[PDB]
Design a protein around this ligand. Structure first.
Ligand SMILES: *[C@@H]1O[C@H](CO)[C@@H](O[C@@H]2O[C@H](CO)[C@@H](O[C@@H]3O[C@H](CO[C@H]4O[C@H](CO[C@H]5O[C@H](CO)[C@@H](O)[C@H](O)[C@@H]5O)[C@@H](O)[C@H](O[C@H]5O[C@H](CO)[C@@H](O)[C@H](O)[C@@H]5O)[C@@H]4O)[C@@H](O)[C@H](O[C@H]4O[C@H](CO)[C@@H](O)[C@H](O)[C@@H]4O)[C@@H]3O)[C@H](O)[C@H]2NC(C)=O)[C@H](O)[C@H]1NC(C)=O
Ligand SMILES: *[C@H]1O[C@H](CO)[C@@H](O[C@@H]2O[C@H](CO)[C@@H](O[C@@H]3O[C@H](CO[C@H]4O[C@H](CO[C@H]5O[C@H](CO)[C@@H](O)[C@H](O)[C@@H]5O)[C@@H](O)[C@H](O[C@H]5O[C@H](CO)[C@@H](O)[C@H](O)[C@@H]5O)[C@@H]4O)[C@@H](O)[C@H](O[C@H]4O[C@H](CO)[C@@H](O)[C@H](O)[C@@H]4O)[C@@H]3O)[C@H](O)[C@H]2NC(C)=O)[C@H](O)[C@H]1NC(C)=O
Ligand SMILES: *[C@@H]1O[C@H](CO)[C@@H](O[C@@H]2O[C@H](CO)[C@@H](O[C@@H]3O[C@H](CO[C@H]4O[C@H](CO)[C@@H](O)[C@H](O[C@H]5O[C@H](CO)[C@@H](O)[C@H](O)[C@@H]5O)[C@@H]4O)[C@@H](O)[C@H](O)[C@@H]3O)[C@H](O)[C@H]2NC(C)=O)[C@H](O)[C@H]1NC(C)=O
Ligand SMILES: *[C@@H]1O[C@H](CO)[C@@H](O[C@@H]2O[C@H](CO)[C@@H](O[C@@H]3O[C@H](CO[C@H]4O[C@H](CO)[C@@H](O)[C@H](O[C@H]5O[C@H](CO)[C@@H](O)[C@H](O)[C@@H]5O)[C@@H]4O)[C@@H](O)[C@H](O)[C@@H]3O)[C@H](O)[C@H]2NC(C)=O)[C@H](O)[C@H]1NC(C)=O
Ligand SMILES: *[C@@H]1O[C@H](CO)[C@@H](O[C@@H]2O[C@H](CO)[C@@H](O[C@@H]3O[C@H](CO)[C@@H](O)[C@H](O[C@H]4O[C@H](CO)[C@@H](O)[C@H](O)[C@@H]4O)[C@@H]3O)[C@H](O)[C@H]2NC(C)=O)[C@H](O)[C@H]1NC(C)=O
Ligand SMILES: *[C@@H]1O[C@H](CO)[C@@H](O[C@@H]2O[C@H](CO)[C@@H](O[C@@H]3O[C@H](CO)[C@@H](O)[C@H](O[C@H]4O[C@H](CO)[C@@H](O)[C@H](O)[C@@H]4O)[C@@H]3O)[C@H](O)[C@H]2NC(C)=O)[C@H](O)[C@H]1NC(C)=O
Ligand SMILES: *[C@@H]1O[C@H](CO)[C@@H](O[C@@H]2O[C@H](CO)[C@@H](O[C@@H]3O[C@H](CO)[C@@H](O)[C@H](O)[C@@H]3O)[C@H](O)[C@H]2NC(C)=O)[C@H](O)[C@H]1NC(C)=O
Ligand SMILES: *[C@@H]1O[C@H](CO)[C@@H](O[C@@H]2O[C@H](CO)[C@@H](O[C@@H]3O[C@H](CO)[C@@H](O)[C@H](O)[C@@H]3O)[C@H](O)[C@H]2NC(C)=O)[C@H](O)[C@H]1NC(C)=O
Ligand SMILES: *[C@@H]1O[C@H](CO)[C@@H](O)[C@H](O)[C@H]1NC(C)=O
Ligand SMILES: *[C@@H]1O[C@H](CO)[C@@H](O)[C@H](O)[C@H]1NC(C)=O
Length: 1171
């Protein structure tokens, strides 16, 4: 669907209203007033606009000449009011001291526009919507039509009244128009701004936002100025009221109004809307039918009425409660208590006069205690609060009891709120949000429901938009329909659509319309699963929450088929489709097809209720396991080797598989070891192996070796054992010793028996991976592969000659010492004398158990204890060295004795392990910031010793980087308190100290001033920076974030207070700085871990754009644009014009360069060059 819309072709719009009979929509705008159809087609356009005029002029140029210069100005529609009684439209403008227009209702024919007298002028004010009011009428001949109207004044106190009661004559040409209801030389039916109050508070003014007639009164929601809150302007939002039948204007009342949400103040009205609550909200808010209610919108605080805050709150007032606050306040002043308290009106405070009276809601004011104010600000019940997108407008309405609220947003969005405080729920909940002018055109206060209350016309600055109160048809499913909750929506069961009660035919009948999710259609089928091979199966259907279907029903499995059904009890009986029909579906989807079986109602002819219905196909299973041990009833035929639903389709009786444990499958034995190039048989076990039948061949073993696949015929001995015949196997590579290979056991050529455990054959070669005795006896005892002394290589007994009865050696259980251990290399080459070092020895022909190498390892004399977990048998020993303090030697060779220190079974390291004692004497900054992050350079001797290193400053750990013989470099942690700190370095079990070498933590540096407060796009200019403790950071640098890019540049520290910095380049091909200048997203300095200096909140640093230069005894003159920027202070570019290498003395001007020449020319300024 699309939202019906009227676009504002040229100008902004201001007001909208709907005619209660026709549904015609009238639209006030700047310079225009439109009549529109219900669907927002243009019907008629009135020009009201651009008028030659001037605001300063009293009576406008028409009546008297004005000395002030006139110009073509825009006429803003300030107000718009439907006068149904006199078949017309009051269309009050501005820009003529506020003269009012009368347009005829059905064609916009100007009936009248009075502007001779002073009353025909309303206000100079050129602001839209700061005005409001109501039209009230009696029958012709009686007390005639009146207009109550508030407007701002702009300080023109003596020209215009802010609030007035004015006359509406039947003749638009009649001069009496907009004259006051009762005028006297003492009191007139108007209320003026006192001159004394404008002298005191310069630009006090009353802005009227909303207005409505209620019972017998007239209310206004207003904004005023600081008068007990010269200074600055802060506003107070108030309610005003009058009796309709009070020509004297004595009934005037004025209470401050707002509401609070968790200690946050909302005191600025943006809009309101008087309404009903309907049965729902009325009851639990405690009201009678015709009792009224006022929805409102407030912004946070009391700041900036011209441009309010995003923070906004929708509150609520019951009029009975405001009526009680006013009655309570009047029955209080008629007790003589306190003053009237109305700052702007009465400057000197007159007192409350006591008197005996029957104070009623019918009270219309009296002569003494006069116009009066309000002390107790009236608090409202909060409903919904937007924090990211400010509310702008509101409306509400009664729907079948439930109270729907409409809320415009600054974004151009409308919210559809059920108010549920009086309703069961925890608090009033948003139901739905909708889009009007998505780009961010705000919605305006004038937001009216249609007469039929089917739509809601939503006005923006630039477009009117017909938003339906209901569009439930976007909801596809009963479950989503009633899930949205926006109360207009119900599921019209038999039409399978989502819409309102009045739109669902026959909804009034039983179960035909669903309103709570529990009413949703629930369906079940008895035979949920039906086989492809079956046909016309009887199915029973149970359905609940469904109307009387005695109209008739069909079953449609999808848009493929449709079978007739008959009704009995609370059940529906229909048949499955034919095999001829079923397969057209299942073809392609294989294993199974889940299909949504619907019910098609005869009355509607639309599918409404559904179920998961399964069409299973046994035949497509191509193995016993899939067939039986699947999820379905399927039978496997051992002999035909096919899966099917029918027992009889099997070969014969004794070949039917119904149980998964009875399947043809290969069972595992202890691993199948196969040496390459050796004639071997491979016996297998299995279960229920078939006797090959008529015209059927015997068994084979197929080996899936990528290099060569071997086909070897086999013999089936019984239902439980196989054997491939004497053969040898190979693969071409010599790359991997142990290759596991997929084998498939076949019979009758292509029938592959099932392999559940996926049993493999391991093809092993005698080592192409092991040229060391220790490596062979290390590998599987299964391979049978062993080490053969004489050859100096390793192969089976098979492949090695027995010249001695013990010439071929195999690790019996691992009780096999391996001759000639050798050490290749060992890590840490150095270590501390104290020990604790983890020595990492890597050899080739070591022992095969740990408990033999344990006790074997020694470093010269020093006993070394080996580690279990970190020991990799006969390749690697990890060993922990003991205390070597007592050793005389400085360095010693490493020794391993395999089990016994026998003369052939000992290894000695090729180069020797060195003992030292590392020392340190200097640190290369000795100072650094408390936050830390300083690159420290500890100098000493033997610093690269051992395994682990840990540096601790104040007990807190340093982040390590790299190690050297002479240097340790690490990054400092944050210090607890500033000053001297101990440096503790521990290498393994050695903990070395020096109290003469300390580290001094320094108070965090500060940045005060950058001097020039600017630079160009490519940067590179000098910046004279000032602050504190700047010598405590060795390498500080400037940081700047422009757009999505972050960039850095260098600094040179001079004093503890002074620093020269080279400005960061922000060169971005996406954004260029404007001629005016631009602040970066972030600007700061990188100083170790002091992170508060990375981002500068107070900084006003600006970036200007990068010079334009024109090419080809008298002096040189070089012309061009952008030579000098509009920069603060003196600060300008240090230009240098050079010739081959010689610089000149030049005076720089804004368009020209005055170099001096004696007769290849290069101009330089920072990092800029041009020829
Ligand atoms: C439920 O699902 C089943 C199974 O998924 C399915 O039945 C299939 O129906 C379609 C028809 O649309 C068949 O597909 C066509 O096959 C045409 C030729 O079929 C020959 O080859 C068959 C395949 O042999 C394979 O499977 C066996 C066992 O697993 C395996 O050992 C082999 O190595 C091999 O991989 C073979 O089964 C078939 O023999 C059947 O028919 C005879 C006579 O009725 C019967 O006695 C046998 O018992 C057996 O059922 C036959 O020899 C072929 O023309 C065609 O291929 C063309 O089109 C495609 C697509 O456009 C191209 O890609 C291709 O290049 C060709 O141009 C097509 O593939 C399929 O064979 C059936 N499946 C089986 C197992 O028979 C049904 O949809 C469902 N059942 C019902 C009742 O609805
Ligand atoms: C640690 O060292 C740092 C830096 O190394 C040092 O900071 C400077 O200290 C020197 C003195 O040692 C000061 O220089 C003196 O300035 C006297 C006149 O000041 C005027 O001129 C200043 C320099 O102009 C240069 O820089 C500008 C801007 O970069 C540039 O446009 C020019 O082309 C020119 O190269 C100028 O900055 C200064 O403006 C300051 O004051 C204003 C207003 O109060 C303020 O708003 C600014 O923020 C700015 O600070 C002003 O216009 C000058 O008389 C004096 O010359 C005497 O001394 C020399 C050498 O000893 C003698 O030969 C000679 O006979 C004179 O007696 C000298 O040139 C300079 O002011 C300091 N800089 C700053 C930024 O304050 C710190 O003092 C040292 N810190 C500590 C703690 O010891
Ligand atoms: C395929 O569709 C079928 C629709 O028929 C689904 O079958 C139903 O499956 C559920 C469980 O998945 C069963 O519910 C259970 O009922 C148990 C009691 O079972 C007895 O009572 C059954 C009805 O009164 C009766 O059918 C059943 O007899 C069965 O077993 C006999 C012996 O093996 C056999 O000879 C008969 O032919 C028959 O199959 C028992 O006497 C109860 O203990 C459980 O707690 C559970 O509630 C339904 O009973 C099944 N319906 C039928 C008609 O058998 C099936 O789920 C679908 N398959 C898949 C994979 O989804
Ligand atoms: C570890 O580092 C800190 C910080 O860098 C070292 O303290 C600094 O020592 C240097 C020496 O180079 C001082 O500079 C000298 O200051 C002498 C006079 O000091 C007074 O005047 C200072 C500047 O006007 C003033 O800050 C300081 O007051 C400080 O101490 C007060 C009492 O403890 C304290 O309440 C204040 O807040 C303030 O921190 C002195 O009154 C002067 O004779 C020299 O001419 C030279 O300028 C710095 O002032 C010291 N800076 C700081 C921040 O304390 C400390 O010595 C280092 N530790 C070791 C063991 O070396
Ligand atoms: C101005 O606004 C009016 C309404 O404010 C509007 O005119 C209406 O149009 C609707 C359809 O948008 C019409 O309603 C129809 O009523 C007849 C019965 O007389 C039905 O047959 C119609 O049903 C059809 O449409 C259904 C929904 O699309 C289909 O499901 C169905 O199959 C039918 O095809 C439909 O309910 C109606 O005629 C008028 N309203 C009135 C009161 O006459 C119009 O959009 C706007 N016109 C202009 C000129 O701007
Ligand atoms: C509920 O179910 C009933 C029964 O299951 C079902 O009745 C079906 O009605 C249609 C008519 O709408 C029958 O189809 C006809 O059969 C003749 C042969 O006897 C065909 O020649 C016709 O097919 C032509 O028209 C089709 C549609 O335009 C074309 O697709 C086709 O090319 C032909 O030109 C004719 O339609 C059908 O036989 C029965 N079904 C069965 C199983 O007999 C009905 O749809 C449902 N009832 C209601 C009230 O909706
Ligand atoms: C099905 O047939 C299989 C294979 O033909 C039979 O497995 C065989 O079981 C016999 C025991 O009778 C094993 O014989 C043994 O051999 C060793 C020789 O090293 C000998 O020392 C023992 O005295 C014993 O005779 C034989 O290894 C094994 N066959 C193969 C090929 O490994 C099985 O008995 C039959 N199963 C049923 C249920 O009938
Ligand atoms: C040797 O056999 C193994 C195991 O049988 C093969 O590896 C894997 O084979 C399985 C089949 O069981 C594949 O699994 C598949 O996974 C998908 C997941 O989407 C599933 O939909 C299928 O039903 C199936 O189970 C798996 O892809 C495959 N592994 C790899 C990495 O491809 C292996 O292919 C055989 N070796 C050689 C050399 O052929
Ligand atoms: C077969 O079913 C068994 C028992 O339910 C289960 O343990 C196993 O996962 C299934 N195996 C296969 C291969 O489907
Ligand atoms: C081949 O297998 C047969 C039967 O298992 C056996 O008698 C013979 O020893 C095997 N021959 C060789 C060379 O391995």
């Amino acid at each position: 669907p699309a939202f019906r819309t009227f676009v504002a072709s040229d100008w902004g719009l201001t007001h909208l209203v709907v005619h209660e009979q026709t549904g015609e929509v009238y639209v006030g705008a700047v310079n225009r007033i439109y009549k529109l159809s219900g669907n927002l087609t243009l019907l008629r356009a009135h020009v009201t606009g651009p008028v030659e005029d001037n605001e300063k002029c009293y009576p406008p140029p028409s009546v008297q000449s004005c000395p002030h210069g006139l110009g073509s100005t825009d006429n803003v529609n300030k107000l718009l009011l439907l006068d149904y009684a006199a078949n017309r439209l009051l269309a009050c403008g501005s820009a003529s001291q506020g003269i009012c227009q009368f347009l005829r209702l059905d064609d916009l024919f100007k009936l009248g526009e009075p502007h001779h007298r002073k009353e025909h002028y309303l206000s100079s004010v050129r602001e839209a919507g700061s005005m409001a009011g109501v039209l009230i009428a009696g029958p012709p001949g009686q007390g005639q039509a009146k207009l109550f109207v508030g407007t701002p004044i702009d300080g023109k106190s003596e020209y215009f009244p802010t609030l007035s009661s004015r006359r509406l004559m039947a003749n638009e040409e009649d001069a009496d128009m907009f004259g006051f209801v009762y005028q006297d030389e003492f009191v007139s039916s108007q209320l003026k701004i006192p001159s004394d109050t404008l002298s005191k508070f310069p630009a006090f003014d009353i802005y009227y936002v909303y207005s409505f007639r209620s019972e017998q009164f007239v209310y206004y929601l207003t904004l005023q100025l600081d008068t007990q809150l010269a200074g600055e302007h802060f506003f107070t939002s108030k309610i005003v009221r009058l009796c309709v039948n009070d020509p004297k204007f004595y009934s005037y009342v004025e209470f401050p109004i707002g509401c609070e949400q968790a200690g946050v103040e909302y005191r600025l009205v943006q809009d309101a809307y008087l309404s009903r609550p309907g049965q729902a909200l009325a009851k639990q808010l405690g009201l009678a039918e015709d009792e009224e209610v006022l929805f409102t919108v407030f912004a946070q605080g009391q700041k900036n009425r011209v441009k309010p805050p995003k923070e906004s709150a929708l509150c609520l007032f019951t009029l009975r409660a405001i009526k009680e606050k006013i009655k309570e306040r009047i029955q209080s002043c008629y007790r003589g208590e306190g003053k009237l308290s109305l700052p702007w009106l009465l400057n000197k405070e007159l007192g409350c006069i006591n008197s005996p009276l029957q104070i009623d809601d019918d009270f219309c004011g009296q002569d003494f205690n006069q116009p009066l104010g309000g002390t107790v600000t009236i608090e409202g019940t909060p409903l919904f609060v937007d924090k990211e997108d400010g509310l702008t407008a509101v409306a509400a309405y009664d729907y079948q009891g439930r109270t729907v609220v409409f809320a415009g947003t600054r974004s151009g969005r409308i919210r559809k709120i059920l108010v549920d405080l009086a309703n069961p729920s925890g608090r009033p909940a948003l139901a739905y949000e909708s889009v009007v002018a998505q780009e961010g055109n705000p919605i305006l206060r004038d937001l009216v429901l249609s007469p039929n209350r089917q739509y809601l016309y939503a006005m923006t600055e630039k477009q009117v938009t017909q938003v339906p109160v209901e569009s439930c048809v976007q909801y596809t499913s009963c479950e989503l329909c009633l899930g949205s909750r926006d109360p207009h929506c119900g599921w019209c069961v038999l039409h399978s659509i989502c819409s309102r009660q009045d739109a669902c035919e026959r909804a009034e009948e039983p179960q035909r319309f669903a309103s709570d999710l529990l009413q949703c259609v629930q369906l079940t089928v008895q035979p949920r699963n039906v086989s492809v091979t079956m046909s016309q199966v009887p199915l029973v259907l149970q359905a609940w929450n469904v109307p009387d279907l005695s109209a008739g029903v069909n079953c449609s499995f999808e848009d493929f088929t449709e079978t007739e059904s008959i009704l009995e009890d609370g059940r529906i009986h229909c048949h499955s489709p034919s095999a001829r029909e079923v397969a057209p579906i299942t073809q392609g989807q294989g294993d199974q097809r889940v299909v949504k079986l619907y019910l098609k109602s005869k009355e509607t002819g639309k599918k409404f209720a559904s179920v998961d219905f399964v069409f299973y196909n046994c035949s497509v299973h191509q193995s016993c396991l899939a067939c039986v041990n699947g999820s379905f009833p399927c039978h496997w035929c051992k002999y035909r080797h096919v899966c099917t639903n029918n027992a009889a389709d099997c070969a014969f009786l004794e070949g039917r598989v119904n149980m998964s444990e009875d399947c043809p499958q290969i069972l595992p034995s202890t691993h199948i070891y196969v040496p390459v190039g050796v004639v071997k048989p491979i016996t297998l076990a299995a279960r229920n192996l078939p006797q090959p039948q008529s015209g059927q061949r015997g068994y084979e073993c197929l080996f899936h070796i990528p290099g060569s696949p071997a086909r070897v015929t086999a013999l089936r001995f019984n239902s439980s054992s196989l054997q491939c015949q004497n053969s040898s196997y190979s693969y071409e590579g010599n790359d991997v010793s142990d290759l596991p290979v997929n084998l498939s056991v076949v019979w009758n050529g292509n029938f592959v028996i099932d392999n559940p455990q996926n049993i493999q054959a391991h093809l092993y070669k005698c080592p192409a991976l092991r040229q060391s005795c220790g490596l062979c006896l290390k590998a599987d005892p299964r391979f049978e592969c062993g080490w053969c002394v004489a050859e100096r290589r390793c192969s089976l007994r098979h492949h090695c000659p027995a010249d001695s009865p013990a010439s071929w050696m195999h690790a019996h259980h691992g009780s096999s010492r391996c001759t000639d251990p050798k050490i290749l290399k060992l890590s840490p080459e150095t270590g501390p004398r104290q020990g604790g070092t983890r020595l990492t020895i890597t050899g080739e022909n070591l022992g095969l158990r740990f408990e033999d190498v344990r006790l074997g390892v020694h470093v010269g004399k020093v006993l070394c204890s080996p580690v279990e977990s970190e020991y990799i048998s006969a390749e690697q020993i990890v060993c922990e060295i003991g205390d070597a303090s007592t050793l005389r030697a400085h360095d010693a060779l490493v020794e391993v004795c395999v089990r016994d220190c026998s003369l052939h079974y000992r290894a000695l390291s090729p180069k020797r392990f060195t003992f030292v004692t590392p020392t340190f004497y200097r640190v290369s900054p000795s100072r650094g910031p408390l936050s830390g992050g300083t690159w420290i350079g500890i100098e000493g001797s033997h610093l690269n010793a051992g395994s682990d290193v840990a540096v601790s400053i104040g007990g807190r750990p340093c982040s390590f980087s790299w190690r050297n013989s002479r240097e340790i470099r690490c990054l400092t942690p944050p210090g607890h308190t500033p000053g001297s700190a101990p440096i503790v370095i521990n290498i393994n079990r050695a903990q070395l100290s020096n109290p003469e070498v300390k580290y001094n933590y320094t108070e965090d540096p500060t940045i005060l001033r950058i001097d020039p407060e600017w630079s160009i796009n490519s940067g590179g200019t000098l910046l004279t920076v000032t602050g504190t403790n700047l010598a405590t950071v060795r390498e500080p640098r400037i940081r700047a974030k422009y757009g999505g890019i972050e960039r850095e540049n260098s600094c040179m520290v001079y004093n503890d207070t002074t620093m020269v910095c080279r400005a960061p380049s922000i060169d971005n091909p996406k954004r260029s700085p404007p001629e005016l200048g631009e602040r970066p997203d972030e600007i700061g300095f990188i100083m170790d871990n002091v992170r508060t200096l990375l981002v500068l909140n107070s900084s006003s640093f600006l970036y200007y754009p990068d010079p334009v230069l024109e090419p080809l005894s008298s002096p040189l003159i070089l012309k061009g644009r952008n030579l000098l920027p509009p920069a603060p202070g003196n600060s300008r570019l240090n230009y240098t014009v050079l010739i081959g290498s010689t610089p000149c003395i030049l005076t720089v001007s804004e368009t020209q360069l005055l170099c001096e020449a004696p007769n290849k020319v290069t101009v330089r300024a920072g990092g800029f060059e041009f020829s």
